[PDB]
Every structure is written in structure tokens, then in C-alpha cells.
Amino acid sequence: YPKKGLSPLALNTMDQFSSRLIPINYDQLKKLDAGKQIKLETTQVSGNF
Amino acid sequence: NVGYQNGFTANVTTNYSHTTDNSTAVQDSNGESWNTGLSINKGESAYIN
């Protein structure tokens, strides 16, 4: 959606329409201190043709 | 460069953004730098309009 050669989007920037940012506790941070990476998942999209 | 060795007579870029993308050029500089009229330390901020 930002094409090849352009800048990426932001996620939950501090604005009028936003949300609380996402917290990590200590134990998940210590697991992130190992080689365990974050998986992004998409449930379903709603679109038109 | 100087020569081309064959009938190309054109050059290829590394970035091909369209004309919807422009880089605005500052002018009337006069040597007077950006941190001169306004005092910014190592960890301060400055807002844009």
C-alpha cells in the first residue's frame, strides 16, 4: 500500500483517533532477550471488488 | 561517464518516484544556521508548521 520507493505507515500514533500502546512485562521481555521473535497475524480483511 | 560503447545514449537512475513526490528546497539561508536563533541543547525538541 505504500509502494516500492516510499515510506512505511505508523501504528497507533498519538493523535485524536488512537489507542493505548502495547505493554510488555518483564518475562516476555526476557524471552525477547533470547532469539524468540514476534509473529504478526491477520484475522480477516473487509473489502470490495 | 564519458563514453557508452554502444547505441544506448541514455542513463538509468536508482530511484523512480513519480511526480507526486517533491523535495522542497530551502533558500535565503545567508549563513545564519538553524540552531542559531533558537536555543536547542542535546535533548530538546522543536515543533513544525
Side-chain angles (χ1 to χ4, degrees):
Chain A
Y1 161 76
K3 281 181 159 62
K4 204 164 303 174
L6 294 181
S7 81
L9 274 178
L11 194 72
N12 197 20
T13 182
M14 285 82 74
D15 74 89
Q16 188 71 43
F17 268 80
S18 314
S19 89
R20 165 192 184 248
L21 269 69
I22 304 109
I24 312 177
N25 54 3
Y26 198 74
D27 270 8
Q28 274 176 1
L29 186 72
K30 299 327 270 179
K31 258 182 291 199
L32 190 46
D33 216 5
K36 312 229 274 190
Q37 70 272 15
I38 294 172
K39 294 193 175 284
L40 276 163
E41 173 187 355
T42 53
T43 57
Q44 38 88 32
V45 296
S46 314
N48 297 93
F49 56 95
Chain B
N1 41 36
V2 173
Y4 294 98
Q5 306 155 332
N6 206 358
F8 208 89
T9 75
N11 305 314
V12 291
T13 176
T14 193
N15 181 216
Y16 204 76
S17 88
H18 283 255
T19 81
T20 67
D21 159 85
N22 75 313
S23 297
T24 183
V26 68
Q27 51 193 355
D28 273 354
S29 88
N30 208 356
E32 185 166 5
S33 180
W34 278 119
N35 214 347
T36 51
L38 51 92
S39 50
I40 289 301
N41 321 323
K42 195 187 172 302
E44 311 317 304
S45 43
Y47 291 173
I48 307 170
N49 184 15

